[PDB]
Design a protein around this motif. Structure first.
Motif, PDB file in Angstrom:
ATOM      1  N   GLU A   1      -9.852 -15.894  -5.403  1.00  0.00           N
ATOM      2  CA  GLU A   1      -8.465 -16.310  -5.196  1.00  0.00           C
ATOM      3  C   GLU A   1      -7.527 -15.122  -5.363  1.00  0.00           C
ATOM      4  O   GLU A   1      -7.744 -14.258  -6.222  1.00  0.00           O
TER       5      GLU A   1
ATOM      6  N   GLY B   1     -10.456 -29.012   0.135  1.00  0.00           N
ATOM      7  CA  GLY B   1     -11.118 -28.406  -1.017  1.00  0.00           C
ATOM      8  C   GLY B   1     -11.767 -27.060  -0.714  1.00  0.00           C
ATOM      9  O   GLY B   1     -11.338 -26.314   0.171  1.00  0.00           O
ATOM     10  N   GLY B   2     -12.824 -26.752  -1.469  1.00  0.00           N
ATOM     11  CA  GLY B   2     -13.525 -25.485  -1.304  1.00  0.00           C
ATOM     12  C   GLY B   2     -12.594 -24.299  -1.480  1.00  0.00           C
ATOM     13  O   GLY B   2     -11.733 -24.280  -2.366  1.00  0.00           O
TER      14      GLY B   2
ATOM     15  N   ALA C   1      -0.413 -28.041  -5.564  1.00  0.00           N
ATOM     16  CA  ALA C   1      -1.071 -28.254  -6.853  1.00  0.00           C
ATOM     17  C   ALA C   1      -1.499 -26.949  -7.511  1.00  0.00           C
ATOM     18  O   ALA C   1      -1.638 -26.904  -8.738  1.00  0.00           O
ATOM     19  N   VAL C   2      -1.714 -25.899  -6.727  1.00  0.00           N
ATOM     20  CA  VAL C   2      -2.029 -24.586  -7.253  1.00  0.00           C
ATOM     21  C   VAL C   2      -0.776 -23.722  -7.186  1.00  0.00           C
ATOM     22  O   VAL C   2       0.196 -24.028  -6.489  1.00  0.00           O
TER      23      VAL C   2
ATOM     24  N   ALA D   1      -8.711 -24.859  -1.329  1.00  0.00           N
ATOM     25  CA  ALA D   1      -7.912 -25.265  -2.480  1.00  0.00           C
ATOM     26  C   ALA D   1      -6.951 -24.167  -2.930  1.00  0.00           C
ATOM     27  O   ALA D   1      -5.901 -24.467  -3.506  1.00  0.00           O
ATOM     28  N   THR D   2      -7.296 -22.897  -2.709  1.00  0.00           N
ATOM     29  CA  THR D   2      -6.442 -21.802  -3.145  1.00  0.00           C
ATOM     30  C   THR D   2      -6.102 -20.800  -2.044  1.00  0.00           C
ATOM     31  O   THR D   2      -5.433 -19.800  -2.330  1.00  0.00           O
TER      32      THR D   2
ATOM     33  N   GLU E   1     -17.333 -10.332 -16.286  1.00  0.00           N
ATOM     34  CA  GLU E   1     -16.653 -11.024 -15.202  1.00  0.00           C
ATOM     35  C   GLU E   1     -17.164 -10.621 -13.829  1.00  0.00           C
ATOM     36  O   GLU E   1     -16.692 -11.160 -12.822  1.00  0.00           O
ATOM     37  N   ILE E   2     -18.108  -9.684 -13.765  1.00  0.00           N
ATOM     38  CA  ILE E   2     -18.684  -9.279 -12.489  1.00  0.00           C
ATOM     39  C   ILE E   2     -19.501 -10.428 -11.917  1.00  0.00           C
ATOM     40  O   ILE E   2     -20.370 -10.993 -12.593  1.00  0.00           O
ATOM     41  N   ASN E   3     -19.229 -10.777 -10.662  1.00  0.00           N
ATOM     42  CA  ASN E   3     -20.020 -11.780  -9.944  1.00  0.00           C
ATOM     43  C   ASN E   3     -20.195 -11.268  -8.516  1.00  0.00           C
ATOM     44  O   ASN E   3     -19.386 -11.571  -7.638  1.00  0.00           O
TER      45      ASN E   3
END
Lengths: 685, 687
Positions: A342, A529-530, A560-561, A533-534, A333-335
């Motif tokens: 988020e 967006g982008g 929506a989130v 969004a969160t 999961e490392i990025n």
């Protein structure tokens, strides 16, 4: 904006540190110790049990002084494959050094590892002598430093960066108050005292950089209070300094979730600009160590955790849970290329810590349209904002800044925001992002009782302004879209009805207009967006008030989130106390208690914040440097109570202006050091 | 031909011909397609022809193996032999081309003659998308060399007269648009793994590389992920779009989807890419679900330009193909005619395709300056600028699909009823603006009816007897002059016909309905009698006063047609009358008014589609909204338009806004006069 302790760190080290800052307080990185020294055998066992690798694998230079490496059969640091394999697979590398020394001057370390010690009970090695040129302690010290530097240089050659945790647990039990002779360091590098210890750290730091090592993030292991502040002092005297440390670590065995919370928060309070990590953990003979997610939920929001091997290793049951917990980052999961991550609203609020309002600045207004940007920013007596102001707040224990902005004088006839103004808002947002703070940007004196206010909780006003308001927020959202989750939007400040009624609207339809604005604000931001969004968004009650009618008629916008909304109210209660009260008495304290009680009863799953508080009462009268001493104490008592009650209710607070005001901002220095002192002691305890 | 402007500004004639054909069938029928068996053949289409007796219209080929060495002597793939493509095109099939851009597994790997040593993403190769753009990297050398290889094949196809849909770099975003940021949501092809900015650079590089090499036989298709089927957890991939100048068609790849899902995907992409055609670039089955029947998806609203199933385990069953290849809405290879200039369309299909409509009012319907004036004198007499091509292009570019062109004729008719040639030519020119823009267009007879001074068509027994031949002579001329335009052009016989006393709600005498119904029959008879395209062109007949009351609807008799399903009823709605003057918000009374209207129209007309030919804020004194109206009045207009559009959509109808949104000097910019009203309409329609 990235500046590590090593000012010449390569691009990969700065990239790793930037990634750590991204996840800090959001998720926790998993780690596992090597089986003893130079492998990832324990991580391999975790992978077989759970199907997942830990994010970090730690290696130990403990046996760097053993001869015949490559033929002794059990240790060879010249082969960097055990580390290279881990990094090439995407794993994060951590390095430590149990600095073994010969037991005396004639002892030669054997190929079997014989003849080594680590404290005065095992060796005559003296930390003092290791620093004077031309000593047997010095020549062993300097050429094992040479040997480890050569290994790290080869790691850097292969593109490896690493966390580096040398000289850990320096203080040991030396911080014991009584001075009984069991109060001693258990490692040789701490047994001659803190000042020699710091110089060991400085010598290794300087020696490493002059060898060309620029791939390391430096982590110092604090003992805090050894679990009992009644019995030990802390080890602040052992801190090598902000210029030589990137991460503060703690080693805990057999600790519960609540004990972890205590250690983490105490360390975070004394090292505000540093990230705090659980550098070692595990079980002991008495108790197991707490579940990672449970400890996190208690507030132990470490950067990472790393259990020890062997008898300290948690059970298979423990690893099965931990590796499957959402808050835990595993190796897959490392990025490190992510620029945004988020974060739930409750998580953000718990990381705000102490907050501050940059008031009377970008919210200042009234000089007309078409003026230079600096004319608005200084119109109400504040100096132009600078990077050092945001840096000062972070370095001094604040983690969040609210940036009020008034917009109407910067909008043309068609509702477009003047580009120079929006660029200035961005620069100040950037100041805060660069400092590592959370930041809130809002729409401020466009609401309430000012002359230019145009957003009002009124049916007809809403109809005439709905599109202008959404067009404003579309522009703001698009202009700040690229900043990460540390930036939040606040839709509006203190909306009143058309008669400027402060407690509640005269007509119930005023609540309907408020709720519509709030829904329109969320909609306009999410539509871009982008990251938006969160992004966490903040919605204020009517008048930012907290009465029962206002709260009962407040409707949270539909999103929506999930879990990305915060409610904000303001509190100058009990109203006008600075003019009418001599001390912050039980009536003052009980007023605040009922406010937080009422809020926590209303909002169970939605976090709320105290977006403004202070001594400001009637006629804009408030505390200042020149106030009588008892009046400054009245301000200090209010802020201490506010900060403590908010922490206990899992909220957050933002002081309105007084503590960091006017010319003090340019210095930079606290306007009211006693009030800030009371706040820090309230929060950090 | 002349009106065609593709993303490739230098597209050759054959590519423009194919593109014009695609626009002819779009929204009318769906082109069948099939993927090659893996790469360079039409083996799967051949099996379809064995099973059904019919070929899919399109066969898609894949350049997936272009880098395999020893082509011509490896015994299994040779792109230098273009026979598999020319065989198909020579037989009348349409060519589609795609490219699974395989790359070496690492810098030291040589792709073998057997296909070994290739990978397509970071789990299989070290090839990085960002390096492919940087001159001097091993990725860039491979990238440019394979691009030259593919361009050389396409140049050979172009020399053989082949044109093709080109769908490179597909499904770029993968799952990388995940809202949270967890790295299980990532691109599954290497060309999206460095993000949308690198991806668009890759697209532009290929487009300009191909164009510089002289490739002008391609229609470029970009594959969108939309919301990956779940907008609650995904952003859309708008940041990945290469841009209008680099894309002709938007594709979507859907496996195991239902009819309602496909409708949702089609309508969402259509709303965000209004000037482009939307295609089902890939479809098929998965483990759990069949893919929906094409006709059932089509009738749910998923009117893709084409569909194309994948091969292998994704291939639909023989029963599925046997149904699909026999559906009338599906074009098979033998039915392709790229020389066609017209394709019959049912009235309901056209009304569904109208989308958002606009009235080009107070323009060709302007009148009162007398006979014998220059054409421009009429067209600008009521303050509007002369219509241009850019005006119609602006409508299509901004989410409208139909324009109503009111025309008033009496000042351009001589004593014997002959229409002045210069005027008829100008009507033709403006129709051509709309046709080139890809819109539906309605041409009518406008202020020759109703309350004006020159009106001569009236719902009255005597007026009808005196004018019936002039009326038929007028429509014979109009129909003969406009006969050659395709099915996107509709005729509307008359606007708002009243009796001899200009009675607005109802005629004074029931014989007024009889006269109205007779004019309506004469209009249809006159148009049908001209033959050709006009034998099946969709025609529009209006109720009395274009009204909607109980008596008017009760006494309306649809004309008898010679063909099935080519008539549309039109009414106008400015209800509640004068609301813009008397109301402050669009409230329940306003909303209830419109819902009863649509209920009444839907009850009276069932298989017969109806449209709202005019609506707006226009009330008494013809006072209406303008850009200088107070913002709360603009909100009132936005709320009316949003209600009108949504209600009409749910009732399988369509609407045409009267003027206010695109008015006066705003037309020549071009730009909306009322952007918030248009935004309200777009959100209502596209939701």
């Amino acid at each position: 904006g990235v500046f590590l302790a090593d000012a010449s760190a390569n691009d990969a080290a700065k990239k790793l540190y930037k990634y750590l800052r991204l996840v800090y307080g959001n998720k926790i990185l998993s780690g596992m110790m090597a089986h003893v020294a130079w492998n990832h055998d324990e991580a391999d066992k975790i992978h077989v049990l759970t199907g997942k690798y830990p994010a970090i694998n730690c290696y130990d230079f403990i046996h760097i002084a053993v001869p015949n490496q490559g033929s002794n059969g059990w240790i060879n640091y010249n082969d960097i494959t055990p580390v290279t394999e881990w990094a090439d697979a995407g794993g994060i590398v951590s390095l430590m050094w149990h600095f073994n020394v010969p037991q005396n001057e004639n002892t030669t370390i054997g190929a079997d590892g014989s003849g080594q010690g680590i404290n005065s009970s095992q060796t005559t090695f003296k930390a003092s002598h290791a620093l004077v040129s031309g000593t047997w302690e010095n020549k062993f010290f300097m050429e094992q430093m040479e040997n480890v530097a050569n290994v790290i240089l080869k790691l850097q050659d292969a593109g490896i960066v690493a966390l580096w945790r040398p000289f850990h647990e320096a203080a040991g039990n030396a911080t014991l108050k009584s001075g009984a002779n069991w109060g001693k360091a258990w490692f040789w590098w701490g047994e001659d005292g803190p000042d020699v210890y710091k110089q060991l750290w400085h010598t290794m730091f300087n020696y490493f950089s002059n060898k060309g090592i620029h791939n390391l993030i430096w982590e110092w292991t604090s003992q805090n209070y050894n679990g009992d502040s009644d019995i030990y002092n802390n080890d602040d005297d052992w801190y090598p300094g902000d210029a030589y440390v990137d991460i503060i670590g703690r080693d805990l065995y057999g600790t519960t979730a609540v004990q972890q919370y205590s250690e983490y928060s105490q360390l975070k309070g004394r090292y505000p600009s540093k990230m705090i990590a659980l550098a070692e953990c595990g079980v002991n003979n008495s108790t197991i160590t707490a579940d990672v997610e449970q400890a996190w939920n208690a507030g132990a929001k470490w950067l990472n955790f790393m259990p020890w091997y062997g008898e300290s290793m948690p059970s298979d049951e423990w690893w099965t849970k931990v590796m499957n917990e959402n808050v835990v980052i595993t190796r897959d999961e490392i990025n490190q290329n992510a620029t945004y991550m988020e974060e739930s609203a409750q998580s953000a609020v718990d990381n705000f810590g102490l907050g501050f309002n940059l008031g009377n600045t970008l919210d200042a207004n009234g000089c007309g349209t078409g003026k230079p940007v600096a004319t608005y920013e200084t119109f109400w007596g504040q100096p132009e904002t600078t990077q050092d102001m945001m840096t000062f707040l972070m370095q001094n224990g604040f983690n969040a800044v609210r940036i009020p902005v008034t917009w109407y004088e910067h909008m043309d006839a068609e509702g477009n925001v003047d580009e120079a103004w929006m660029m200035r808002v961005k620069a100040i947002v950037e100041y805060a992002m660069n400092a590592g703070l959370y930041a809130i940007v809002n729409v401020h004196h466009d609401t309430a009782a000012g002359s230019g206010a145009w957003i009002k909780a009124d049916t007809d006003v809403y109809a005439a302004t709905k599109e202008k308001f959404k067009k404003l927020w579309t522009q703001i959202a698009n202009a700040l879209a690229d900043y990460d989750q540390h930036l939040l939007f606040e839709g509006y400040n203190e909306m009143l009805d058309g008669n400027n009624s402060w407690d509640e609207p005269q007509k119930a339809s005023g609540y309907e207009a408020l709720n519509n604005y709030a829904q329109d604000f969320v909609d306009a931001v999410r539509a871009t967006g982008g990251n938006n969004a969160t992004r966490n968004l903040i919605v204020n009650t009517y008048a930012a008030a907290k009465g029962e009618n206002v709260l009962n008629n407040f409707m949270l916008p539909t999103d929506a989130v999930n879990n990305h909304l915060i409610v904000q109210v303001h509190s100058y209660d009990p109203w006008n106390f600075f003019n009418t009260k001599t001390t912050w008495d039980s009536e003052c304290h009980n007023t605040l208690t009922e406010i937080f009680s009422a809020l926590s009863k209303k909002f169970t799953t939605i976090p709320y914040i105290i977006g403004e508080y202070g001594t400001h009462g009637e006629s804009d009268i408030s505390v200042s440097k020149s106030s009588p001493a008892e009046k400054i104490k009245l301000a200090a008592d209010q802020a201490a109570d506010m900060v403590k009650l908010a922490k206990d209710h899992h909220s957050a607070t933002f002081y309105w202006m007084s503590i960091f005001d006017g010319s003090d901002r340019i210095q930079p220095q606290w306007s009211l050091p006693t009030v800030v002192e009371a706040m820090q002691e309230a929060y950090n305890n």
